Design an enzyme around this catalytic site. Structure first.
Site, mmCIF file in Angstrom:
data_model
loop_
_atom_site.group_PDB
_atom_site.id
_atom_site.type_symbol
_atom_site.label_atom_id
_atom_site.label_comp_id
_atom_site.label_asym_id
_atom_site.label_seq_id
_atom_site.Cartn_x
_atom_site.Cartn_y
_atom_site.Cartn_z
ATOM 1 N N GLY A 29 2.074 -0.883 6.348
ATOM 2 C CA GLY A 29 2.416 -2.087 7.025
ATOM 3 C C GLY A 29 1.945 -1.985 8.534
ATOM 4 N N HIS A 47 -4.804 6.409 4.401
ATOM 5 C CA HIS A 47 -5.276 5.081 4.586
ATOM 6 C C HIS A 47 -5.298 4.998 6.041
ATOM 7 C CE1 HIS A 47 -5.721 0.627 4.466
ATOM 8 N NE2 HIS A 47 -6.799 1.029 3.920
ATOM 9 N N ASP A 89 -10.492 1.410 2.126
ATOM 10 C CA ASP A 89 -9.552 0.259 1.358
ATOM 11 C C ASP A 89 -9.530 0.576 -0.056
ATOM 12 O OD1 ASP A 89 -9.135 -0.752 3.778
ATOM 13 O OD2 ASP A 89 -10.326 -2.464 3.625
#
Length: 121
Positions: A29, A47, A89
């Site tokens: 988030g 990530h 990604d």
């Protein structure tokens, strides 16, 4: 960008990205990073760490090109940064799918102020 990214997650996990991720744990988030709560959250940690390497492009905005061949994400294009961005990604999307087993919906909107200091990447 978040469009490609979200499409990838949807393609790998089969889940609605904005809903199931996007505000999950201490890392998934927009509140920055934190000590991972579980495997899924660890995926988002890595990530965000992968993003700290990108030179020249914007993860949130810059678009890139990838293909979905035989249900395999394939990054493809000359731009090195975009290629890198795409690999980041792809990796979290796959990591998320691989940890579906322990996904905890109760961490879905976890209050980030309850998080600990995240180790540096």
């Amino acid at each position: 960008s978040l469009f490609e990214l979200g499409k990838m997650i949807l393609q790998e996990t089969g889940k609605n990205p904005a809903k199931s991720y996007g505000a999950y744990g201490c890392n998934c988030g927009v509140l920055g990073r934190g000590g991972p709560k579980d495997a899924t959250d660890r995926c988002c940690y890595v990530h965000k760490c992968c993003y700290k390497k990108l030179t020249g492009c914007d993860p949130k905005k810059d678009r890139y090109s990838y293909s979905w061949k035989d249900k395999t994400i394939v990054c493809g294009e000359n731009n090195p940064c975009l290629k890198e961005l795409c690999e980041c990604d792809k990796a979290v999307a796959i990591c998320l799918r691989e940890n579906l087993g322990t996904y905890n919906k109760k961490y879905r909107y976890h209050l980030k102020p309850f998080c600990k200091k995240a180790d540096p990447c």
